Each structure stands twice: as C-alpha cells, then as structure tokens.
C-alpha cells in the first residue's frame, strides 16, 4: 500500500499512537546481560536502554570491552550504522577508541549538549584548534581542523591521532543543530537535506566501518536518522518502490537495537521525511 495513502489514512483516523503502540508490541526482545554488570553501571546513561548481547560494539581491550553502542545490519539495503548514546564523562575516551577501531569516516550528532536546560551529552569534541583534547585512557589526540556553521547544521573537520602508532585519520562531525526540545520539526526539509550532506560526504559508503550516529539515548532522533536512510535507499534499488514498508523496515532495524523511534510524533516524522524525499528525488 502506497505508504502516501497510508499516511492521510492514519492522519484523517488520528491512530498514530494506536500503530505505535502495535510496533511497540511486536518488536523483538533479546538479553542484555553484559549492559546490565554491575562493573557497567556508569557506562550506561539511561538504566531502560541498553545494547543486545547479539549485536553489542565490543572494544578491542581486555580489561572491559562495553560500550553502549549497536550494529545496526540492513542486509537487502547493503548499508550498516552503529547507534549509540551521547558520550558520558566517563566514556569519551571509549567513544573516540570504538571510531578508531571500526574505522568509521563520521560521527552524526543530532541533539545539543545542553537541551531543556540539563546536559544530554558531554563536550565531547574540541571547539578550538590550538586546544586539542588528549584521552589518556585509551590514548587518542583529538584537533579542530576546520568548522563550517550553517543556519540547520555544522559540520566539522577532526583529526584523530592514535599515540600508539601516531596514525592518523581524517573524521568529519555531521552536527544537526535545531531539533526541538520540544517536539519534531514542522517540515522535514532541514533533515533530508541535512542527510543528503552526510551522504555526499562518503561518511555512509561501504569503503569505510559504519557511521556512528548518536542523539541523547541513541534510539529516538537517531532511530528517525537511519529508517529514512534506509527507507529512501530500497525505493531507489527496487522493482516497484511502493513495495517499502516502513513498519517493517522499523521491525528488522529493532531486531538490532531496541526501542528505535520512542514516540507517535517521531513514527509519523519518519514517514513524512521519506514520502517527501521520495517525491522530491523521484524525478529532481
Ligand atoms: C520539500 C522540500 C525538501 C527538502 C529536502 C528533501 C529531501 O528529501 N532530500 C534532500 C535532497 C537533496 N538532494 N537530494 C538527492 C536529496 S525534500
């Protein structure tokens, strides 16, 4: 069904929170033991959010290899995504090791780190270039290279240095500025055009690891992020485009990382992004 006609269907009969409810209901439960140790418990920012065991980022250290952070595998759309939560004090280094380490081109940042006057995240990059930051835990040196600052969006240049092997890489910051505290926007515009950017960029091409895209919890903002992507991708790559389901592209994304699109207003959010970016690119 047409997911255009879906979406007046839904909206005329106002089920938005009755079709939420039913994806909330079939969505896929596997353990989290290892998020739930006790040794993990200041690694984690929301105590009901955490990565499954099955498709956890491990860290390539002895010690201890937890991070909360997903793989998130859409095999017939030939794109992966690692979801994970805004860095904690405590967890910037271990942050900055699994980009190093998954060999990622971008990290996308969709909230501010200060929202409805609390921190959602910690300051987690440098925002000069003659003050680098140094993660003496994992041993990294993060450098301000350049900043552009538009009116939706800023994106950044980095440079990762790896003090072991003195490696270095080039990591561009894709950081969506103007989500609500409130909300979702009222147009979808400033988004899909923001994730047209990230794909321009290469930072989603599979000649690199996966992008890292994170919100607060790693599950909402960034959950709308990656459905779209992928829901745009497969009308492109099929026979028949009316054929994508994104109740069902949503279902298979939750079988990674749970809780992906935490409100009724954001499920309808994602369908107006990619029926308007489909109308948009179906021809332009
Ligand atoms: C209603 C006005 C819109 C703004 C953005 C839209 C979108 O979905 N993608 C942006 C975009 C740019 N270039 N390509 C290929 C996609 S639609």
Same mark, same amino acid.
């Given at each position: ?18 079709? #939420?409810?039913?994806?909330?209901? !079939?969505?896929?439960?596997? @353990? ?7 040794? $993990?418990? $200041? ?32 095999? !017939? ?13 405590? /967890? ?22 200060? !929202?409805? %006057? ?8 440098? *925002?000069?270039? !003659? ?7 994992? $041993? ?23 003090? /072991?092997? *003195? ?9 969506? /500025?103007?989500?609500?505290?409130? +909300?979702? @926007?009222?147009? @979808?515009?400033?988004?899909? $055009? ?7 960029? +290469?930072?989603?091409? @599979?000649?690199? %690891? ?22 745009? &991708? ?16 949503? &279902? ?6 749970? %809780? ?6 954001? &499920?309808?959010?994602? #369908? ?13």
């Amino acid at each position: 069904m047409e997911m255009e006609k879906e979406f007046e269907q839904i909206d005329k009969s106002g089920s938005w929170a009755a079709i #939420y409810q039913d994806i909330r209901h !079939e969505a896929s439960d596997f @353990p989290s033991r290892v998020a739930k140790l006790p040794k $993990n418990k $200041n690694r984690n920012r929301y105590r009901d959010v955490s990565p499954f065991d099955h498709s956890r980022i491990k860290l390539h250290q002895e010690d201890n290899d937890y991070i909360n952070a997903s793989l998130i595998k859409m095999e !017939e759309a030939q794109r992966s995504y690692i979801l994970t939560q805004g860095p904690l004090p405590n /967890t910037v280094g271990h942050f900055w090791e699994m980009v190093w380490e998954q060999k990622s081109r971008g990290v996308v940042m969709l909230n501010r780190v200060m !929202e409805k %006057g609390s921190l959602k995240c910690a300051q987690y990059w440098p *925002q000069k270039e !003659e003050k680098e930051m140094i993660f003496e835990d994992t $041993n990294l040196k993060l450098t301000l290279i350049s900043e552009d600052i538009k009116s939706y969006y800023t994106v950044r240049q980095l440079e990762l240095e790896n003090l /072991t092997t *003195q490696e270095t890489r080039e990591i561009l910051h894709f950081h969506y /500025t103007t989500w609500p505290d409130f +909300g979702v @926007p009222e147009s @979808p515009a400033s988004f899909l $055009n923001f994730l047209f950017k990230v794909r321009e960029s +290469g930072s989603l091409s @599979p000649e690199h %690891g996966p992008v890292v895209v994170h919100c607060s919890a790693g599950i909402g903002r960034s959950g709308t992020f990656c459905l779209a992507d992928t829901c745009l &991708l497969l009308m492109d790559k099929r026979k028949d485009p009316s054929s994508v389901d994104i109740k069902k592209v949503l &279902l298979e994304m939750r079988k990674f990382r749970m %809780g992906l699109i935490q409100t009724a207003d954001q &499920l309808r959010f994602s #369908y107006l992004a990619v029926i308007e970016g489909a109308k948009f690119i179906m021809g332009d």
